[PDB]
Subunit: 329 residues, 2 copies
């Protein structure tokens, strides 16, 4: 079996009979698939529990994901292989109004309002990979730190401080947020994790056997930024948004790092230093992507590698050879 | 008027009549202070709404804060000057059991369980200053970016990478988390904000007219670390936990910066670069604290300033004079 719990936001205002139409189609199909649960409706927010055989649940949840009548869908729990059915049937409750609101539905309802509003805001400040772990029933705070091989990614906007002395502050922030959105979408598509924003810099990492994905993400970011520059409106600062990218590979510590008022699930280790130094090297090179020989050698695809001089980095143990990609330049 | 909403965690297991004793004393005193609301009890979690005149509310909430029977108290909303009383009276509900659990208290109750468990975890990953803004009824996502003068603080563990090649990974993380806990407590006490952890480094900031508080925090961190080293158990790695600290002052942009899966409320600007460079300079100096002449000159107390040579930084516009504190060395 399987039980899913999720919360979503109205993509637009939904009338009375519109939300009741939801409940009807859902009841019809869930009854067909032996799926029980409940769909609660509050002020512009949906919450729903649904349980049944994973195949039938996986199909339904995915029709729900495609539904354009709501957005910001966050799965709160994914309980794979449940032993007991929590609900005898499936139905819909519209508590936004009343439904016999006494001294026990009134306080409950406000608590759900306040908690959900707060949860929805906290979500936007939370590293994206935390939620998934919670859905799996494992508390990410209790993950023990471990040594793991990773590919570290650093990227950093070229000449940001200039944007800052030529644009109003709202426009500066819009440029940096556009950059981070471009980078985040591609890294995440290629299986990496954006772990930190450091000023105008993205720090990310990939599994240690994913050098090809890290290279592809980096090439795809460089190409997306070239398209963004070329397509920007006339006079847009995005026309001069450039980045450099550095990649390194090594053993790091992954775990919860921080204080008690705030922690991060992130990585520590020398490969972070190396990747950042390689990224900075792009300011002295024509290339916008640099990566270590360990990244080059761990890649499996026949990339158009170019060996850059012989390298002369500092702070490491050896001046490792450095590489980029030369795509018919 | 005023209405407070908050959630807390059991500091220890609480029996049946123990939690009912809560409700009795609360009803007695709230009835005396014309305070209405509700106290819900779920699995090891309290939620409570309380409303009344701010003075009487401020007194009660603070007796609640001191109560050792719960911990992790987070105010979810602080509605100052409420016009209408939301509750006619005050009472307690123990929904952990039943209280007529039909097809409408059962789903509600699970949603409260799941949401609260998720909220409590997200809290530990959230920059500490986000919650406060939410309590004030202002959505921090809607804060517009602004130019503001700040004192930037950077601190960074000396020779961390060594800890990493002499200790098991659980012990390495314990050392770094001890460091961040020491720094965070003092910065926050002195009115600053820890905004980011960058590997073994703390990034923080203070109001621009708070150079004295930033200096005091830095001196207090250095003294707390000296006490920690000296008091550590025999063989403890904390005995060799050292830090450097750099402080700079300047105009930065403060606002929400990030992508759509994750943003930070933080700062951008040159003073960040300067503070980090000054922090790094402590590795070439006997001093463990360095700060710019702008920090020195904006301080109002008669600190024991020492002018360090004449400075020769790079990347800035001028090799500004640098200072530290010499306390009868
Ligand atoms: C909050 C919300 C919850 C929904 N829950 C379900 C559900 O549980 N089962 C289902 O079949 N459709 C559900 N839907 C509707 C589906 O997305 C989709 O419209 C439905 O499968 C259409 O069925 P049809 O192919 O017969 O037209 C939900 C829609 C919304 C807005
Ligand atoms: C979840 C929880 C909620 C509480 N809420 C209240 C309250 O609303 N009003 C109050 O006077 N005491 C409340 N208390 C108890 C107070 O902390 C404190 O024990 C009480 O003021 C003692 O009153 P006394 O001075 O007469 O002994 C609460 C305790 C707990 C664990
Ligand atoms: N440029 C960087 N950006 C982000 N994180 C970094 C950077 N350089 C290092 N780190 C992180 O900091 C950790 C420690 O690196 P650091 O440069 O502080 O070395 P160290 O051994 O502590 O020596 P030092 O006395 O120079 O600080 C690294 O493992 C990595 O996690
Ligand atoms: N060492 C640092 N640690 C953390 N944040 C930094 C650091 N140095 C700079 N920043 C942040 O990055 C922003 C841009 O600084 P940066 O050094 O990237 O300059 P730039 O103008 O973008 O030039 P470049 O082409 O060298 O990257 C700074 O305003 C500051 O917010
Ligand atoms: Mg930059
Ligand atoms: Mg930068
Ligand atoms: Mg260090
Ligand atoms: Mg460091």
């Amino acid at each position: 079996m399987k039980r899913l719990t999720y919360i979503s936001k109205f993509s637009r205002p939904l009338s009375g009979d519109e939300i009741e139409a939801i409940g009807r189609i859902s009841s019809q199909k869930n009854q067909q698939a032996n799926v029980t649960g409940v769909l609660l409706c509050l002020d512009g927010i949906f919450f729903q529990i649904l349980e049944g055989e994973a195949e039938k649940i996986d199909r339904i949840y995915e029709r729900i994901l495609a539904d354009e009548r709501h957005t910001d869908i966050l799965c709160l729990k994914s309980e794979v292989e449940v032993q007991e059915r929590m609900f005898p049937d499936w139905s819909m409750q519209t508590i936004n109004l009343d439904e016999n609101t006494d001294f026990l539905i009134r306080p409950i309802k406000v608590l759900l309002q306040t908690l959900t509003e707060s949860h929805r805001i906290l979500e936007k400040y939370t590293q994206p990979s935390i939620f998934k772990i919670i859905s799996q029933g494992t508390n990410p705070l209790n993950i023990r730190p471990k040594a793991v091989e990773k590919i570290v990614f650093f990227s950093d906007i070229v000449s940001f401080s200039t944007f800052a002395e030529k644009l109003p502050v709202e426009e500066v922030v819009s440029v940096v947020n556009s950059y981070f959105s471009v980078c985040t979408a591609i890294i995440t598509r290629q299986g990496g994790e954006v772990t930190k924003f450091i000023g105008d810099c993205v720090m990310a990492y990939f599994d240690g056997d994913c050098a090809d994905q890290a290279i592809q993400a980096s090439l795809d970011i460089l190409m997306e930024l070239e398209i963004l520059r070329n397509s920007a409106p006339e006079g847009s600062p995005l026309r001069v948004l450039y980045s450099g990218i550095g990649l390194a590979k090594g053993k790091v510590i992954e775990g919860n790092i921080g204080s008690e008022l705030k922690r991060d699930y992130t990585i520590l280790g020398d490969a972070v230093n190396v990747a950042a130094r390689l990224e900075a090297l792009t300011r002295q090179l024509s290339q916008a992507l640099v990566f270590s020989s360990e990244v080059k050698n761990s890649a499996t695809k026949s990339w158009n590698f170019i060996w850059l001089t012989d390298s002369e980095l500092k702070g490491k143990s050896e001046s490792i050879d450095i590489y980029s990609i030369d795509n018919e330049m």
